[PDB]
From a paper:
PfA-M1 has broad substrate specificity, preferentially cleaving P1 residues Leu, Ala, Arg and Lys; however, it can also cleave Phe, Tyr, Asn and Ser. Examination of PfA-M1 in complex with compound 12 revealed the molecular basis for the inhibitory activity of this compound. The inhibitor coordinates zinc through the oxygen atoms of the phosphinate group. The oxygen of the central phosphinate moiety also forms hydrogen bond interactions with Tyr580, and the amino group forms hydrogen bonds with Glu319, Glu519 and Glu463. Furthermore, a hydrogen bond is formed between Gly460 and the oxygen of the carboxylic group. The aromatic ring forms favorable hydrophobic contacts with Val459, Met462 and Tyr575. In total, the compound forms five hydrogen bonds and is further stabilized by hydrophobic interactions. Superposition of the compound 12 crystallographically determined binding pose with those predicted by FlexX and MVD, show strong agreement between the computationally predicted binding modes and the crystallographic data. The highest correspondence between docking pose and crystal structure was obtained with FlexX software. Composite OMIT maps of compound 12 when bound to M1 and M17 were consistent with our previous observations and showed discorded electron density of the Leu sidechain when in complex with both M1 and M17. This indicates that, similarly to the compound 12-M17 binding conformation, there is flexibility of binding also in compound 12-M1.
Residue numbers in the entry: 196 to 1084
The structure:
């Protein structure tokens, strides 16, 4: 089990200048021929020539057209091809090989594989070695000349990187195409596609050089009508990079291709981006609302990779966050600008603080640049991606837009066409920092700790106001808990965007201010503060930290009502809920432990409920934001604040609090649900796929959130509304009608209705599966068995498997059933899935990530299942490594 260390990076003793590929696709096999034009590098010390090559069937190997002898001149163990140095030339030479591979039976979906009737590759991170021999690491830059041949009837459309320079017929109903891609690239950016693809296309003209760029979006013929939004998003992405960053696309053509079987969301292969169909295809009739922001972000993300990933590349995989964190940040700026809704930024924070904070306090905790790895496939984490994006976003907060764009331009200008490391980016920002501070001695050396230090910092506050002096003080402290990566944590450079609200009239008291906390603690003093303010802290969520604001609920309510910053309002509400949750949780826990016959619960704050009512009734307030304030914090956010969490007690706590608020506001909820209908469900542009209205979709989110609250509350006659809702043309609505009907006798009736609506669209059916899986049903285990026997069956499609099982794992009462039956079920699925797709098997482990945070019985139940999984003789390296780290073994 080899461990790779970041400090051990050394350049290869070899060079690969040119790759010439012939990929010959046949019915039962694919033959790959490869000529590598190679050289000896200056770092060479006479070593053996070792290629990566996984699962390759060798027909022959040669050096300079001389066939090599197995055993005497090379060995191959199905992972590494070793050519003994004595047979390696000392100057420029040609290495060639012909191997056989089998996309048809490649169910792991890495390397070359068959998705339905499409042949497609996935090479990031270590997939190219499953196609042919290579020194499979991102610093090996080469030119590519690729020929693909196949049966013309089955695979009429052939695609690879670069320019298609020849097309030709072949005897036997076959045909070929040759693509030449002269610019250097790492092998993980190579891609090929063959299939019966249909397309939409458009011509984009670049802003500055006026180059015409051909845009193609591809799917199977059945869903070609679902391609329109993707095309619009691509156009939007190119414009944004041009307008914000001044970056134009440099190639003559860009292809997007949707496939049904894909491990993640998408992949940025140069000129040939490949997508999970669920992140490229949509139509108003056959998609839930969520698909529209999803496609916008994933298309945007892959496009922005063209610079941050494809033109400036990684030296080694340890720099992953430099392309992933930076590209997520670029995608976030894009989406906020495109949606023009505050819920876009709130949704990313909601994700970070639930899922990534959980990871960062688990045994899997790591910095966004790890010091080591065993499995590259487990390196792609919410930490590297989403905390990475927050660290990338803090440069913009610190510098402001103008100097940030200057720093970013320095980075692209200085590293375009080269490999780079996280340090190169910090250096570029530092130059901006210098300029901004008008001080050549300013540096961002401390900033680098954001890359190396794991764990979530805690930032806490105390305040002082001297009325006679008009002087306000904010005392700030930062603390990161020691963990397995650092025994001693150092103070970070933490930018704290702040405002001061006058509690008397709700007005801003100071101009925009970012506090630069660089010590363990500091005191920030403000003069000429006319009245005691309420501090608006970490506006926009300006650092990825635990915020402990030490405000009263009265203060949080005033912020919630009157603050200008969406995140601080949302967070003040979040904090009011958390105080209530912790208090009620302990009251329920104590009653349970002491087996009390009677006890008291502390009611929800009445002025809080009044403030929620005030905001809901404000016709000028945002519907998206409203839906957040009537929702309790996520379970996986809550668990960060509770030791030995008893999931049953938390379920009871949430139920009490929702009932408390509903007892007061249900009439308001119903009234809004009714009044929102006309605007929310407007059908005016239902048949225009380029017309996407994010505010309107937020109005549906609010209606659907309210309907759920009303249904759980058993509001009088709400079943009437539920049944009418099931008749809506919008899938977000009629799938919502399915899950809220769970609390009624009509459920299986709507189950059958919505199934029939969903079954003839692959992606819609998967959304149906998710809805069923997430249904709040007492018979949920029997329902899941029904899904297995009747719908899922033996599908190896990762979208199907994830649809059936993952939403269910968020069922707090039922997945965590004290028998452990839920843990047993998911473990069976993980072990089953691991036989053909280790990557997705590891994704399916996600519910276990909080295992040591639960009550001691559930900890033991989960640990038992993970140890059972670890004991499987056939367990993959991928899953084994993950569970070993997760169980601290
Ligand atoms: C935030 C998502 C939209 C990003 C994608 C994957 P990616 O675009 O970062 C690509 N680089 C990749 C592909 C396959 C394996 C590893 C990495 C995702 O996770 O869905
Ligand atoms: Mg299918
Ligand atoms: Zn990416």
């Amino acid at each position: 089990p080899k461990i790779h260390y970041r400090k051990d990076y050394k350049p290869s003793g070899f060079i690969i200048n040119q790759v010439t590929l012939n990929i010959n696709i046949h019915d039962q096999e694919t033959i790959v021929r490869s000529v590598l034009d190679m050289d000896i590098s200056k770092h060479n010390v006479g070593e053996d020539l070792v290629f990566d090559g996984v699962g390759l069937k060798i027909n022959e190997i040669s050096i300079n057209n001389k066939k090599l002898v197995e055993g005497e001149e090379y060995t191959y163990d199905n992972e590494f091809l070793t050519i003994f140095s004595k047979f390696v030339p000392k100057s420029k030479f040609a290495f060639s090989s012909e191997v056989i591979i089998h996309p048809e039976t490649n169910y792991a979906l890495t390397g070359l594989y068959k998705s339905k009737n499409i042949i497609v590759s996935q090479c990031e991170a270590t997939g190219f070695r499953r196609i042919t021999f290579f020194i499979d690491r991102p610093d090996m830059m080469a030119k590519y000349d690729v020929t693909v041949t196949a049966d013309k009837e089955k695979y009429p459309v052939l695609l690879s990187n670069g320019d298609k320079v020849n097309e030709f017929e072949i005897p036997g109903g076959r045909h070929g195409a040759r693509f030449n891609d002269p610019p250097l690239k790492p092998c993980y950016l190579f891609a090929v596609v063959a299939g019966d693809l249909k397309h939409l296309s458009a011509t984009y003209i670049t802003k500055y050089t006026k180059k015409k760029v051909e845009l193609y979006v591809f799917s199977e013929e059945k869903y070609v009508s679902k391609l329109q939004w993707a095309l619009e998003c691509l156009k939007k992405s190119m414009a944004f990079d041009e307008d914000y960053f001044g970056l134009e696309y440099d190639l003559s053509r860009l292809n997007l291709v949707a496939v049904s079987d894909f491990n993640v969301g998408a992949m940025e292969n140069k000129g040939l981006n490949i997508f999970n169909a669920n992140s490229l295809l949509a139509s108003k009739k056959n998609s839930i609302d969520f698909s529209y922001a999803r496609i916008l972000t994933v298309v945007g993300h892959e496009y922005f990779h063209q610079y941050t990933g494809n033109r400036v590349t990684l030296r080694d995989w340890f720099q992953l966050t430099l392309k992933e964190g930076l590209t997520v940040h670029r995608e976030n700026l894009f989406s906020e600008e495109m949606t023009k809704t505050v819920t876009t930024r709130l949704s990313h924070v909601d994700l970070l603080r639930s899922v990534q904070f959980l990871e960062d306090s688990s045994p899997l905790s790591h910095p966004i640049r790890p010091e080591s790895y065993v499995s590259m496939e487990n390196f792609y984490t919410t930490t590297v991606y989403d905390k990475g994006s927050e660290v990338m976003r803090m440069y913009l907060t610190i510098l402001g837009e103008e100097y940030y764009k200057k720093g970013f331009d320095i980075y692209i200008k200085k590293n375009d066409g080269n490999t780079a490391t996280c340090e190169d980016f910090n250096y570029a920002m530092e130059q901006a920092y210098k300029m901004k501070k008008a001080d050549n001695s300013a540096n961002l050396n401390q900033y680098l700790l954001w890359f190396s230090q794991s764990g979530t910092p805690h930032v806490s506050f105390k305040y002082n106001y001297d009325a006679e002096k008009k002087q306000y003080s904010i005392h700030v402290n930062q603390y990161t808990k020691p963990d397995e990566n650092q025994k001693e944590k150092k103070p970070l450079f933490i930018p704290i965007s702040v405002g001061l609200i006058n509690p008397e009239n709700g007005k801003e008291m100071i101009s925009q201010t970012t506090l630069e906390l660089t010590k363990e603690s500091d005191t920030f003093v403000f003069n000429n503060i006319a009245v005691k303010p309420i501090p608006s802290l970490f506006r926009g969520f300006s650092a990825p930290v635990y915020i402990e604001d030490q405000l009263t609920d009265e203060e949080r309510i005033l912020l919630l009502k009157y603050d200008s910053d969406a995140f601080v309002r949302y967070n003040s509400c979040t904090n009011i809920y958390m105080k209530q949750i912790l208090m009620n949780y302990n009251e329920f826990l104590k009653a349970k432990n002491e087996k009390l016959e009677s006890f008291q619960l502390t009611p929800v704050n009445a002025q809080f409920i009044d403030a929620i009512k005030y905001l809901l009734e404000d016709p000028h307030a945002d519907a998206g934001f409203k839906s957040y304030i009537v929702s309790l914090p996520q379970d996986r956010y809550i668990i960060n604040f509770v030791s030995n969490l008893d999931t049953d007690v938390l379920a009871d706590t949430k139920e009490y609090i929702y009932k408390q608020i509903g007892d007061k506001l249900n009439d308001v909820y119903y009234k809004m649900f009714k009044s929102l209908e006309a605007k929310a469900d407007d059908l005016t542009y239902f048949n225009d796929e380029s017309h996407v209205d994010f505010d309107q979709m937020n109005m549906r989110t609010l209606r659907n959130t309210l309907l759920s609250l009303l249904s759980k509350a058993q509001y009088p006659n709400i079943l009437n509304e539920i049944i009418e809702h099931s008749k809506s043309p919008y899938p977000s609505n009629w799938l919502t009608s399915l899950s809220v009907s769970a609390y009624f006798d009509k459920y299986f009736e709507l189950y059958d209705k919505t199934y029939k609506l969903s079954k003839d669209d692959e992606l819609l059916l998967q959304e149906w599966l998710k809805t069923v899986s997430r249904s709040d049903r007492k018979d949920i285990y029997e329902i899941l068995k029904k899904l297995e026997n009747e719908v899922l069956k033996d599908s190896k499609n990762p979208n199907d498997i994830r649809a059936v099982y993952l939403p269910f794992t968020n069922n707090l009462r039922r997945f965590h059933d004290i028998s452990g039956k839920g843990y047993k079920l998911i473990a069976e699925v993980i072990t089953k899935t691991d036989k053909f797709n280790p990557m997705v098997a590891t994704q399916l482990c996600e519910p276990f990530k909080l295992w040591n945070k639960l009550d001691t019985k559930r900890q033991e139940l989960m640990l038992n299942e993970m140890n059972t999984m670890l004991q499987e003789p056939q367990i993959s390296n991928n899953l084994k490594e993950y569970l070993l780290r997760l169980t601290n073994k």
